[PDB]
Design a protein around this ligand. Structure first.
Ligand SMILES: [Mg+2]
Ligand SMILES: [Mg+2]
Ligand SMILES: [Mg+2]
Ligand SMILES: [Mg+2]
Ligand SMILES: [Mg+2]
Ligand SMILES: [Mg+2]
Ligand SMILES: [Mg+2]
Ligand SMILES: [Mg+2]
Ligand SMILES: [Mg+2]
Ligand SMILES: [Mg+2]
Ligand SMILES: [Mg+2]
Ligand SMILES: [Mg+2]
Ligand SMILES: [Mg+2]
Ligand SMILES: [Mg+2]
Ligand SMILES: [Mg+2]
Ligand SMILES: [Mg+2]
Ligand SMILES: [Mg+2]
Ligand SMILES: [Mg+2]
Ligand SMILES: [Mg+2]
Ligand SMILES: [Mg+2]
Ligand SMILES: [Mg+2]
Ligand SMILES: [Mg+2]
Lengths: 402, 153, 201
RNA sequence: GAGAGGCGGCCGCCCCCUCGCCCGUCACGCACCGCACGUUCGUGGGGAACCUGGCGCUAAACCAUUCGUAGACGACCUGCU
RNA sequence: CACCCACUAAUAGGGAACGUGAGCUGGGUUUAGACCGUCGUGAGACAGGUUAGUUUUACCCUACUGAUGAUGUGUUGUUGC
RNA sequence: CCCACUGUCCCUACCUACUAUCCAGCGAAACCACAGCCAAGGGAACGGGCUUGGCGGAAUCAGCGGGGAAAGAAGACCCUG
RNA sequence: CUACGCCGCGACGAGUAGGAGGGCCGCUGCGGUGAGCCUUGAAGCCUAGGGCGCGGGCCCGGGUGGAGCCGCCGCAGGUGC
RNA sequence: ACUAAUCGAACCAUCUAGUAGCUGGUUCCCUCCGAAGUUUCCCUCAGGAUAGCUGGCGCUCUCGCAGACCCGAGCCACGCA
């Protein structure tokens, strides 16, 4: 007999292998479709979720209630130190799919990049790519490399560059860099191969890959929640209090026939740490990072055209559970999958942005830098000192300072 | 006394035996299979590590409900445990066999456990009390153990 | 036979060719079918597409990952047809199935080899010219096969190379005929023997 | 030659025999006394080990420890002159 | 089942052992107590009404959910399709 | 039925104790033709086995309640003697 | 040519419930008989040992064991799972 | 309701191996033959008697038993379907 009232299904069947992700980085799985007309460019980047904050901006949406009105919008800060290119892969299109044709690695692979190849770097002899890097010097290896480049030029359809992050510039414990193949788009195979070969051993900042106020896709692994029941995993209805053997369950897991439990029935297991792709994440700001010309510069991080406050994107007391952000950062809009200091993949959008939500100019008026380690109420150190004046510890330091 | 698998040369070999030993038969069988074929020094330090929970014995046949451990990857297995009582009993038997080897006058730095066997001993009856006036058995599962050590290097 | 039998799949009807191939592999013979995207199926295209969509609907309701595995490549479709004509649940049937190789297009092992044809399975003789038929490549593409375009491009490259090789062979044959016309005083002695015994009209 | 190239073709040098393909002359070979598994691929595939010369290499993985972006336990992310 | 109130794009009909009790609940029916009406001389009866009335076991195999792993590529790792 | 009150609910969340979980020691019972992946067919008219197809990959861990027309009792309802 | 023996020819052979015949099939004990077997190894048990019979079953080899056992003609059953 | 975990008649022993038209089981081999679920009567309808179908034991006769190798020298058995 049918169910007495209709009700939509709990959860999606499009994410059914609700299992721990087989990877921690988060792979792209679909690069933007390549057209030779465009200039040569990269399509992806690797960043680290520093934390969240909120901004104030004036909206330029005609016909809306917030037209020329201020809004407060939550933003996510993703630290993006420049990627370092260390290799080139060529792919050839086969009737069985794409297959890797030839991989050429640069000389002088960075020390942190070599850590990726070793499970136990402490006991390792650090021997990786030592014999390979000697073929960039002798004539025989150089001729073989030229032949490999010619083979890539004449046989490959799409090429990708192996780029790695710079661990030494991040406040995290991990010194093992994250490797990634980033597809090169926009030209003939020869042109993109020349471009990539020039970019070997070089650093690619995030402002070269992405631009202001463009909407990109964020790929990563969500926060792990462990082993969870159906009420927390599939958000099913809680059974009444009078239930005998438990109320945080699913009452009926199937009819008598088909005499089995279907794959579409909500059942307890792993929740979280799933690989997810979210599209249409607008870039509100691309931070410039810290510089030393005459003194340390932090103002280019959170000072706007209306603030003019010599403050950085780092909140008072630092980003909670992350550290201090000193490199380039990308200010996305809204929330992003993953914990703090979780590696994220930023990908160019596969679609064509023509809606008025997209292609809308973003002009920040204020960036909140109050302490997130509590109910912070002062934007900067100097403002807090000017408000609260001298304290007892200031007095006891000043007596010693004479 | 009669052993199974008498040594091919009972002058390079020493024997040990125990009967009705108060250890569980399944854990002892798994531990004995773990130490079978080992050199006597390797077996002794491995049993000490098993007691110290630094190395495990893989539970291969009697593995129903046995949990998984990281030290089972040393073997080709996923499940493993650290039976302290079986390790102590086999350590005592190893010391007895080494003393026998000393008595036979063959050096104990080349001994290898070529044969080790765990046999079920007669069960011993105890009593447990159940819900509705019912009595159920509470048997123990002791074991007979024998081992043969042999000189080779 | 002891050598590998290479069959061109173009212009062949699906079931006829599959039955021939099944009986061949059951006789301890190696069979390789290339260009499985050229296989024809009798009946108009919409009917055969409906047949394969109905096949797509057959899945295990409890756990579709266990159910029938609907293969979308033309080679795998032909392989499944041949398996349907084989006792694939016995050791003999599985051994016979392992002697069959199927490909879309013609791979480098077989693009330099002569390809056989089964007249009993050809569309031109087994089908009336007024009847309609479907291409396995188009049906596979419109049911989920992804590599129709790359297979077409590689087939075009292979056809260009084959055209060059054929022009070389024609030049060689012309030169051979010229050579035969050059040596006839020293060749007529054996030429008349061959003519006497039925060879060499 | 890249679709699975696992292959194919062409040059320069050196060293052989003028033999090898056809029709003929000339005699011989164990001719094993009627008999089967003969005849090839083939120097076949796979595995241990001995000798023989040359040209070359000197590493990782796991456990233990650590982390906590993870976690029932395994597993996972990490760190260690 | 029914009927009514209100919202709604619509408030369509059904199946799966009249889906679903080692999932629940126990209001109903359908034990033992009891009251009423009718019937019976009576014990007692009543698809008539009413009130109170123990809802047991999974640790097995499979299914499903998640978690280790396993086959092959010499070992092992990274990046991938 | 009303006032008050509230997580009964909308609509669930978090925290604590004891477990469950892993380990050292100790260590049962129920149940058991053989066993255990499905669709359809026919069949004692609802198959785990048979027919036809789908297919099938060691050893396991924590859960789970769809199946085993699961277990518990030679049906207490109905009929016969 | 053990006449309860031997030989020839012709036809035929399903089987539940059930009936009958044969059994040089088998178990235990008694009367006879084997100038039977046996500590130079009985019964019993084990056996990748050799065989016989359609079959019930039986004989022989090897091992273990350590004191009893079997064949034939009749007799009698607490006689075959 | 309670009357020693027993109460719409306690417990113990005996009559007692109570009766059962009802359920369950009923132990070696081969060979030959081989069914009925129908008639009549029965407080009979899950059972009997009775006739039918079956088996066993026979008995009374019938054709001759042929030429010691061989070779018949109108008429060709009681009776039965
Ligand atoms: Mg409906
Ligand atoms: Mg309750
Ligand atoms: Mg905070
Ligand atoms: Mg279990
Ligand atoms: Mg108890
Ligand atoms: Mg009690
Ligand atoms: Mg129902
Ligand atoms: Mg149920
Ligand atoms: Mg229930
Ligand atoms: Mg009730
Ligand atoms: Mg009542
Ligand atoms: Mg009255
Ligand atoms: Mg009333
Ligand atoms: Mg009450
Ligand atoms: Mg448990
Ligand atoms: Mg079925
Ligand atoms: Mg009954
Ligand atoms: Mg009863
Ligand atoms: Mg018969
Ligand atoms: Mg008896
Ligand atoms: Mg018996
Ligand atoms: Mg009956």
């Amino acid at each position: 007999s049918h169910r007495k009232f209709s009700a939509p299904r709990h959860g999606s069947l499009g994410f059914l292998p609700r299992k721990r992700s087989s990877r921690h980085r988060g792979k792209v799985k679909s690069f933007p479709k390549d057209d030779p007309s465009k200039p040569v460019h990269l399509t992806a980047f690797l960043g680290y979720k520093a934390g969240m904050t909120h901004i104030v901006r004036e909206v330029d949406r005609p016909g809306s209630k917030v037209n020329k009105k201020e809004v407060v919008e939550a933003v996510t800060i993703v630290e993006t130190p420049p990627m370092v290119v260390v290799g080139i892969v060529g792919y050839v299109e086969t009737p069985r799919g794409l297959r890797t044709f030839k991989t050429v690695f640069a000389e002088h692979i960075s020390d942190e990049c070599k850590r990726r190849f070793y499970k136990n770097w402490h006991k390792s002899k650090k021997k990786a790519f030592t014999k390979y890097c000697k073929k960039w010097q002798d004539e025989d290896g150089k001729k073989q490399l030229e032949k490999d480049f010619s083979s890539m030029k004449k046989y490959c359809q799409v090429i990708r560059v192996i780029a790695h992050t710079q661990m030494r510039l991040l406040p995290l414990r991990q010194k093992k860099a994250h490797l990634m193949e980033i597809q090169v788009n926009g030209g003939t195979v020869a042109e993109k191969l020349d471009w990539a070969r020039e970019r070997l051993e070089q650093q690619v900042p995030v402002n070269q890959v992405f631009g202001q106020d463009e909407m990109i896709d964020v790929i990563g692994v969500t926060k792990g929640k462990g082993y969870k029941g159906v009420t927390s995993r599939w958000h099913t209805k809680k059974l009444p209090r009078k239930t005998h053997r438990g109320l945080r369950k699913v009452a009926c897991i199937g009819a008598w026939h088909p005499a089995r439990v279907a794959f579409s029935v909500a059942r307890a297991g792993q929740k979280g740490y799933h690989h997810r792709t979210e599209i249409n994440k607008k870039i509100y700001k691309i931070g410039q990072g810290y510089l030393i010309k005459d003194g340390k510069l932090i103002k280019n991080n959170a000072s706007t055209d209306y603030d003019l406050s010599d403050k950085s994107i780092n909140p008072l007391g630092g980003f909670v559970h992350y550290g201090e952000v000193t490199n380039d950062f990308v200010m996305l809009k809204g929330c992003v999958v993953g914990t703090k200091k979780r590696v994220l993949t930023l990908r160019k959008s596969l679609l064509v942005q023509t809606k008025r939500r997209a292609l809308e100019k973003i002009d920040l008026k204020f960036i909140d830098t109050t302490s997130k380690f509590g109910h912070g109420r002062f934007q900067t150190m100097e403002e807090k000192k000017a408000f609260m004046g001298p304290l007892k510890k200031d007095r006891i330091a000043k007596e010693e300072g004479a | 006394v009669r052993y199974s698998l008498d040594p091919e040369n009972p002058t390079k070999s020493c024997k040990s035996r125990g009967s009705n030993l108060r250890v569980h038969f399944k854990n002892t069988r798994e531990t004995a299979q773990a130490i079978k074929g080992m050199h006597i020094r390797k077996a002794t330090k491995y049993l000490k590590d098993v007691t110290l929970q630094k190395q495990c014995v893989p539970f291969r046949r009697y593995n129903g409900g046995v949990g998984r451990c990281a030290q089972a990857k040393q073997w080709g297995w996923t499940q493993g445990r650290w039976p302290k009582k079986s390790a102590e009993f086999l350590l005592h038997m190893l010391k007895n066999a080494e003393s026998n080897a000393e008595l036979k006058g063959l050096d104990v730095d080349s001994l290898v456990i070529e044969h080790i066997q765990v046999n079920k001993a007669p069960k011993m009856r105890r009593r447990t009390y159940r819900a509705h006036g019912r009595i159920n058995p509470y048997m123990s599962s002791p074991c007979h153990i024998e081992m043969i050590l042999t000189e080779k290097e | 036979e002891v050598q590998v039998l290479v069959l061109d799949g173009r212009g062949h009807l699906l079931g006829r060719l599959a039955a021939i191939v099944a009986k061949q592999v059951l006789l301890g013979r190696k069979v390789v079918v290339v260009r499985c995207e050229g296989i024809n199926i009798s009946g108009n295209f919409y009917r055969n597409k409906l047949k394969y969509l109905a096949f797509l609907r057959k899945r295990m309701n409890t756990n579709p990952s266990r159910g029938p595995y609907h293969f979308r490549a033309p080679s795998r479709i032909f392989w499944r047809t041949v398996r349907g004509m084989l006792p694939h649940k016995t050791k003999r049937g599985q051994a016979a199935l392992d002697r069959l190789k199927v490909f879309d297009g013609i791979p480098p092992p077989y693009d330099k080899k002569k390809r056989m044809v089964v007249p009993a399975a050809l569309k031109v003789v087994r089908l009336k010219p007024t009847r309609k038929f479907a291409y396995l490549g188009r049906l596979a593409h419109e049911v989920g096969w992804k590599y129709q375009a790359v297979t077409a491009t590689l087939e075009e490259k292979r056809k260009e190379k084959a055209k060059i090789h054929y022009r070389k062979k024609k030049q060689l044959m012309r030169l051979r005929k010229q050579a035969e016309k050059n040596v006839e005083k020293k060749i007529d002695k054996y030429t008349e023997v061959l003519k006497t015994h039925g060879l060499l009209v």
